[PDB]
Write a protein that holds these residues in place. Structure first.
Motif, short mmCIF file in Angstrom:
data_model
loop_
_atom_site.label_atom_id
_atom_site.label_comp_id
_atom_site.label_asym_id
_atom_site.label_seq_id
_atom_site.Cartn_x
_atom_site.Cartn_y
_atom_site.Cartn_z
N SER E 1 0.83 -1.20 0.00
CA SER E 1 0.00 0.00 0.00
C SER E 1 0.86 1.26 0.00
N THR E 2 0.39 2.30 0.68
CA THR E 2 1.16 3.51 0.87
C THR E 2 0.60 4.27 2.07
N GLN E 3 1.51 4.78 2.90
CA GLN E 3 1.14 5.48 4.13
C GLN E 3 1.80 6.85 4.11
N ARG E 4 0.99 7.90 4.04
CA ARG E 4 1.51 9.25 3.88
C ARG E 4 1.76 9.89 5.24
N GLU E 5 2.07 11.18 5.23
CA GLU E 5 2.47 11.91 6.42
C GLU E 5 2.10 13.37 6.24
N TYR E 6 1.66 14.01 7.32
CA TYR E 6 1.20 15.39 7.25
C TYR E 6 1.94 16.25 8.26
N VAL E 7 2.50 17.37 7.77
CA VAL E 7 3.29 18.28 8.58
C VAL E 7 2.74 19.69 8.38
N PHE E 8 2.87 20.50 9.42
CA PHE E 8 2.20 21.80 9.50
C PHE E 8 2.97 22.86 8.72
N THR E 22 11.17 11.08 0.77
CA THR E 22 10.75 12.10 -0.19
C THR E 22 9.46 11.69 -0.87
N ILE E 23 9.50 10.60 -1.63
CA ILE E 23 8.35 10.18 -2.41
C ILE E 23 8.01 8.72 -2.11
N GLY E 24 9.02 7.86 -2.13
CA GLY E 24 8.80 6.43 -1.95
C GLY E 24 8.11 5.76 -3.13
N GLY E 25 8.31 6.27 -4.34
CA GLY E 25 7.61 5.73 -5.49
C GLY E 25 7.71 6.56 -6.75
N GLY E 67 -1.26 21.99 6.34
CA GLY E 67 0.07 21.72 5.80
C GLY E 67 -0.01 21.06 4.44
N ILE E 68 0.97 20.20 4.14
CA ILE E 68 1.01 19.40 2.92
C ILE E 68 1.13 17.93 3.31
N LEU E 69 0.85 17.05 2.33
CA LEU E 69 0.76 15.61 2.56
C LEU E 69 1.95 14.90 1.93
N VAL E 70 2.93 14.55 2.76
CA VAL E 70 4.14 13.86 2.31
C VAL E 70 3.92 12.36 2.37
N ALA E 71 4.36 11.65 1.33
CA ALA E 71 4.31 10.19 1.32
C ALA E 71 5.60 9.65 1.92
N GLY E 72 5.49 9.00 3.07
CA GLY E 72 6.65 8.38 3.69
C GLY E 72 6.48 8.24 5.19
N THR E 73 7.06 7.16 5.72
CA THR E 73 7.02 6.88 7.15
C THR E 73 8.11 7.68 7.86
N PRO E 74 7.77 8.51 8.84
CA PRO E 74 8.77 9.42 9.42
C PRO E 74 9.70 8.71 10.40
N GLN E 75 10.96 8.54 9.98
CA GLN E 75 12.11 8.23 10.82
C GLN E 75 12.15 6.79 11.31
N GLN E 76 11.04 6.06 11.17
CA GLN E 76 10.92 4.70 11.69
C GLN E 76 11.52 4.56 13.08
#
Lengths: 173, 154, 285, 284, 173, 153, 173, 173
Positions: E1-8, E22-25, E67-76
């Motif tokens: 699948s894909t799990q995005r990320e949201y930052v302010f 960055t993108i992951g795809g 904010g904007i919607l970044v695709a990627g898991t933050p920092q694991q």
């Protein structure tokens, strides 16, 4: 100071036993004066899951929850599970409010896990089934305001305050 | 599936009719429907729309009542016979905007309850003005006929 | 050729005009204005013909035989009528405007669409084919405008943006000011793309509500309330008057159509509506 | 664009009488109906928009809501005063319009009667028509392309006919104004203002206390600011006809019917007019 | 699948510590397509205490974090201090919805638990200062936007609307 | 079959008898000349909304209609126009009943509630493309009968 | 020759001993065909006391009930208090008339007394709580339908059309 | 609760005496004001066999009977085959309403057996033979409303109104 609790009112009731002290001080934000319930609270963006009664933090604003206000404490094993919130009686959201309170609030609302494993297919849930309402009357109304049903000959009023208002949103999964 | 103007009018009027408890509310809503269409033509949809929002005297419980009407169908419009009539005609217009997919429900609600989003709602309506003014008046004419058929005079 | 004369002309509303299509369970108004298949105000050529023919008969009593031969004998018609009216298509309609960032402020501006100009150009081409009579001054002006299609443009002004009929915010581009005053006036002229100019022109009509009064109560009768659509003053319609070869067609186009400038169109003639000036392209473009 | 809005009162007061008053009031109504929102740090930060003056003043502190409501009442009164003082009458376009129209009618061989009348009391014509309706609740019969208030020809014809059938029976009227089987023999143009003294519009109020009330226990004043047509404003219209007969009944009807109302609320002396001048141009 | 990320969109600086992918795809959904930034989800119901910023929840619906919607898991190195949630993406509140959605949108949002001691105070903000815009425009977007630097020629179409299209309700305590 | 002209004769009988005032008869004649052309041009559901708007089905004219179903002596009361539109609505509902497009049992507990009347309109909306093609010749016959019998006012 | 039993679609828990004989005949009238139930009847002019549902006769021209058409006799030792009726069978307010009628039949119908210690009061009902709807499916309907598990793959058609199709105006007291 | 008694317009002479008192007070709702019989209560779904004329409780909606609502009792003589009722006096179906109503009522219906011995085949009938209405203006409308022939000088209007405004359903069993 004074802190209040937040028992949402779903079709079932796994939320009755939640507090130590029944009344608190003399403070009870929601008002029942032979005319309907007052100072009720609705929360945009959040949901409730009917099982293991707590709230479910969703993201869409349309997802709203309509619980009520009673003064209490979170049963002495929370704020590690419940989300304590102090707001100054003007930065909150009331509906059909009776009067003013004096900015002394620390509400302890329910909270379950956000369940980031399935999709929150939220469901608009109204209230019907007078037979499910008859007992939930005493489970929430004389549970906190035990002057109702003592002198209050308003049997259908506090019943009619819910069947047309407390239509919340739920997941049901 | 897609509902045309008259069918959408039927559904909207049906969700309004059950919410206006007192009959004076219904008759004031009839008076609304019977002239707000000519108003919308003469003054424009956006002026008249914000006039309706103001005359609905929101900034009360009426707002959550009006948003609940969208889903519960057990909800009741609360207020004076003028306030709920304008509140119900406002629900009419919002229901149109939402079902035709012109503006989303969440944005409309948040613009209706927030000082901030209201101005960008004005901006958005000036963006979307042709898409609305193209055909909203047929749906509102159907609302007018339903009102002057299902409700009587004073 | 097919027609001995082609005489296109413009219809300038002196007063407001009402040429109605009667009531309908589809119009929100009681007495709407004649529309197009596209939706724009129109004057069906039947209305045009009836009005101008009644006028001509009452105003040229000695030339009655010419009017009958060209426009059709009234009753007992042993023949077809040599003349033809095409249809009055909306050229340009006044539209009320709010513009900041403009030196000369305007209360209303002429509005048209590319579709309406396309129909004008289509009439012009079609009548050039059938008449051996061309008006390519018009054709050149109109094609110069149509070259810009797809973008709102101004002709006789520098208006960056504006709000038209208090509901439509549009942004404009100037045109090559070699584009002349087709209206032949000092008012600007917007040419909007059709998906927005349609709504603009439709909201640009005057919907007046009249009533009937109880002569004794001195109040309004029940069911005595209705609306009417008018088209503003100085609105412009374009149509053509065609004529087969004949000796009557000659005298008609050369004496009658010269001295014919004002007429009364449509209904509501007693509340002052319906006065019209006819400017022939031939005479003065 | 929202910037057209938050700068529309400046436009009314600077472009005075050269702005489209219909669209101007229509757009002003958006500000008026979103007042609380246009004040929350959205005055465009200018210095000649009346909208930040409502940030200097303080009318209440125990209620921001009441603050907004009283500010909005003041703003409604101020909009009325703005329109009334700034939008004046320049009646040169109307004088030209009527001269050219009269020449047209002389060509069409009509017999024109050009009538000039003057407002004596604040008039109300078209009180249910949309102009200021979305702010004030009342309106004025406004021609948005002449950019003026006007008296409809239908209204003048209806009043003249009501009088003529009052004093000549319900049959000579139909002899003059026709019926469902004959067209009338008398045509009326709308009336437009050609010259005022100082103002064209004027603010006014009406405050019902008891209308539609049962007792004193539900009485309450509700004051209705609105706009009326100033006194001393002179309207003119034409009356044209082809038969010479109908010249007689209209002539004598003109002076009489005007001293009694020509608009709304004549019963309490509002739309009272004054025949200023009449003139008859016979054709043939 | 894909799990995005949201930052302010803050005025302070703590952004690199957590966002990794960055993108992951192949391609995002949030876009600068020379039409303006699109599909920027809007949270409604949170408050921004942004000195080393992480979101705190409020009770108001007029409090909006954008904010904007970044695709990627933050920092694991997380998933015990983030509000993780996978909405089916038709229960998300966006801006200028152009295209479709992945039919399910897992979002990892930086979160600060309330810990009610004071009483919350939320103040709106409109931003300015083209420098204080660019220094977010092309260091953290740049970390996530890489098809720019060759087609995003007039950065103005973003540097001009970041100071008008974004806002929040700040806490500052 | 042509038994739609027969059905029109029956309906026109009931209406021509239930309109006691000759003004109501002439007004029904006008409705008959107009509404069939309006159903042709603008479609059924628009014209049906138009008709039920101007019939003013309060609670009393409604019972006059339910009785006019059965009692051949029921009358329609109200304004000339207010009863002409209700008579034409009866024409429509009569055709819908006889041709069994909707059960008269349903149509009866609809004209008495205002809470199933909207369901009546919804049902008629689910059947508009059927009714629109059926009623054509029936309404044409009603119009012809009205021009034939009732005096032009 | 034939006497029918007519039971409604309530919410309360008195549904099963209200119907004793499964069919008691040849074949059913209220019977599904995997396209929706057919042949259900709407008795009007009666109310429903939610306690131990029994049709309360009323003067309301808009208060009704909805139930099922089954053969046989109820409980072999009752029907004296019932609404006993032999009918011409064509004056019946049935739904989904896809066949014809026996043109003569008879039904017993439940009944409680007017029992007026308050004024009449009934309110609309839209039966829901699909758990307490599929329970009605499996309690009495699957009992009334000895065809189940011999023709039943789709209980969810029953599920989908009973939630929306059946209603009444309960006493709600 | 103020009791108003019910009785209809039959054609069999079962008309005269159906309440021991005539008015028993000085109130009424079924007015007569030189504008026909105001407020004619209708009750659909019940048919009347005039042989001992009484409403038979049917479930056919089309079978209606509409009669007078006098202020009276069952004489305390016919109380077995009757069914009491307390209703909010707007659950009625009045016709030509002129004002407000008690909203509290006790009516007792002429009520025959459910006729379980036969199929209740229904017969529609109308009213003609103006003496049929004259003799029943005599039979009841004298001993109920003394305002007939004593205050009504234009009774022919009430004649044509009883003739046009009254029709009903029988069984002929």
């Amino acid at each position: 100071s004074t802190q209040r609790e937040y028992v949402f009112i779903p079709i079932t009731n796994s939320i009755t036993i939640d507090v130590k002290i029944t009344i608190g001080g003399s403070d009870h934000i929601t008002n029942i004066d032979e005319r309907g319930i007052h100072n009720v609270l609705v929360i945009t963006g959040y949901a409730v899951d009917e099982k293991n009664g707590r709230l479910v933090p969703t993201l869409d604003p349309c997802d709203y929850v309509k619980g009520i206000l009673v003064a209490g404490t979170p049963q002495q094993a929370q704020s590690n599970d419940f989300l304590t919130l102090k707001l100054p009686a003007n930065k909150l959201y009331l509906i059909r409010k009776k009067g003013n309170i004096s900015d002394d609030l620390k509400i302890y609302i329910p909270y379950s896990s956000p369940d980031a494993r399935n999709s929150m297919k939220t469901k608009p849930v109204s209230i019907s089934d007078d037979t499910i309402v008859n007992n939930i009357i005493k489970e929430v109304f004389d549970k906190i305001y035990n002057i109702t049903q003592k002198e209050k000959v308003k049997i259908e009023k506090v019943k009619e305050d819910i069947k047309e208002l407390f239509s919340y949103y739920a997941l049901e999964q | 599936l897609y509902e045309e103007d008259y069918k959408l009018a039927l559904e909207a009027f049906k969700k309004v009719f059950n919410a206006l408890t007192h009959y004076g509310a219904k008759q004031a809503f009839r008076s609304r429907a019977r002239d707000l269409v000519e108003e919308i033509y003469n003054s424009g949809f956006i002026p008249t729309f914000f006039y309706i929002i103001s005359k609905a005297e929101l900034n009360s419980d009426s707002l959550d009542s009006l948003i609940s009407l969208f889903s519960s169908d057990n909800a009741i419009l609360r207020g004076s016979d003028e306030n709920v009539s304008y509140s119900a005609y406002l629900f009419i217009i919002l229901y149109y905007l939402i079902k035709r997919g012109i503006i989303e429900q969440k944005f409309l609600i948040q613009a209706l309850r927030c000082e901030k989003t209201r101005l960008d709602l004005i901006d958005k309506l000036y963006n979307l003005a042709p898409i609305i003014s193209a055909k909203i008046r047929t749906y509102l004419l159907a609302i007018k006929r339903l009102s002057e058929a299902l409700i009587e005079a004073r | 050729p097919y027609y001995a004369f082609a005489e296109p002309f413009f219809i300038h509303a002196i007063t407001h005009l009402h040429v109605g299509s009667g009531s309908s369970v589809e119009e929100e108004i009681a007495l709407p204005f004649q529309r197009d298949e596209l939706g724009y105000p129109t004057i069906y050529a039947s209305s045009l013909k009836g009005a101008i023919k009644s006028f001509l008969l009452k105003e040229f009593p000695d030339k009655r035989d010419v009017i009958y031969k060209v426009l059709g004998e009234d009753e007992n018609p042993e023949e077809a009528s040599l003349g033809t009216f095409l249809d009055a298509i909306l050229f340009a309609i006044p539209s009320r405007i709010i513009e900041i960032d403009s030196a000369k402020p305007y209360v209303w501006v002429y509005v048209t669409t590319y579709e309406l100009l396309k129909k004008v150009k289509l009439y012009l081409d079609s009548i050039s084919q059938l008449s051996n009579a061309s008006f390519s001054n018009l054709k050149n002006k109109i094609d110069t405008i149509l070259a810009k299609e797809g973008k709102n443009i101004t002709l006789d002004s520098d208006l960056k943006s504006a709000i038209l009929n208090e509901d439509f915010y549009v942004e404009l581009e100037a045109l090559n000011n070699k584009i002349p005053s087709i209206i032949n006036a000092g008012v600007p002229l917007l040419v909007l793309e059709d998906s927005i100019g349609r709504e603009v022109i439709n909201r640009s009509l005057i919907r007046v509500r009249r009533i009937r009064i109880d002569r004794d109560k001195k109040v309004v009768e029940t069911g005595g309330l209705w609306s009417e659509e008018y088209v503003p003053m100085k609105t412009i319609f374009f149509s053509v008057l065609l004529g087969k070869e004949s000796k009557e067609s000659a005298i008609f186009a050369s004496c009658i159509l010269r001295n014919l400038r004002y007429v009364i169109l449509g209904g509501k003639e007693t509340i002052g509506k319906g006065i019209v000036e006819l400017r022939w392209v031939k005479d003065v473009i | 664009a929202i910037d057209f809005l938050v700068n529309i009162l400046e436009l009314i007061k600077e472009k005075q009488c050269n702005i489209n008053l219909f669209s101007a009031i229509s757009l002003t109504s958006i500000v008026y109906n979103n007042f609380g929102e246009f004040l929350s740090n959205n005055q465009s930060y200018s210095t000649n928009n009346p909208l930040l003056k409502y940030h200097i003043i303080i009318l209440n502190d125990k209620n921001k809501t009441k603050d907004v409501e009283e500010k909005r009442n003041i703003f409604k009164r101020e909009v009325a005063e703005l329109i009334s003082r700034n939008f004046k009458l320049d009646g040169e376009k109307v004088r030209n319009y009527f001269d050219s129209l009269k020449e047209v009618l002389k060509s069409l061989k009509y017999t024109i009667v050009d009538v000039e009348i003057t407002t004596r009391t604040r008039a109300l014509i078209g009180v249910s028509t949309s102009l200021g309706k979305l702010i004030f609740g009342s309106g004025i019969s406004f021609d948005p392309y002449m950019n003026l208030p006007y008296i409809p020809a239908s209204e003048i014809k209806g009043i003249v006919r009501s009088y003529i059938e009052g004093k000549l029976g319900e049959q000579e009227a139909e002899e003059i104004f026709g019926n469902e089987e004959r067209e009338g023999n008398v045509n009326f143009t709308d009336a437009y203002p050609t010259r005022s003294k100082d103002f064209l519009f004027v603010p006014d109020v009406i405050t019902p206390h008891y209308n539609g009330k049962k007792s004193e226990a539900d009485a309450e004043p509700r004051p209705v600011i609105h706009l009326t047509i100033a006194p001393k404003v002179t309207f003119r219209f034409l009356i044209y006809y082809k038969r010479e007969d109908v010249g007689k009944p209209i002539c004598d009807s003109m002076p009489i019917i005007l001293i009694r109302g020509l608009g709304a609320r004549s019963s309490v002396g509002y739309s009272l007019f004054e025949l200023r001048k009449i003139e008859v141009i016979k054709a043939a």
